[PDB]
Amino acid sequence: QDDPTCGKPCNTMDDCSNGWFCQACWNSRKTCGPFV
């Protein structure tokens, strides 16, 4: 369980197109987060 993208700040869905779990830039706080 790596998903280093998690917690990574961004404004587009391109800064989270790598993580296995947190593959979402998360516009909720502009900080990459896990999905559901």
d(CA 23, CA 4): 10
Please give the tally of structural domains in the chain.
1
d(CA 1, CA 12): 23
* Experimental approach taken: NMR
**Longest CA span, the chain:** 24
Is the separation of the CB atoms in 24 and 12 below 8 Å?
Answer: no
Cβ contacts of 36 within 8 Å, gap of 6 or more: none
Domain of residue 6 covers: 1-36
CA 18 to chain centre: 8
d(CA 2, CA 31): 16
Cβ contacts of 2 within 8 Å, gap of 6 or more: 19, 20
| Sign of the dihedral defined by the CA atoms of residues 27, 35, 19, 14, in that order | negative
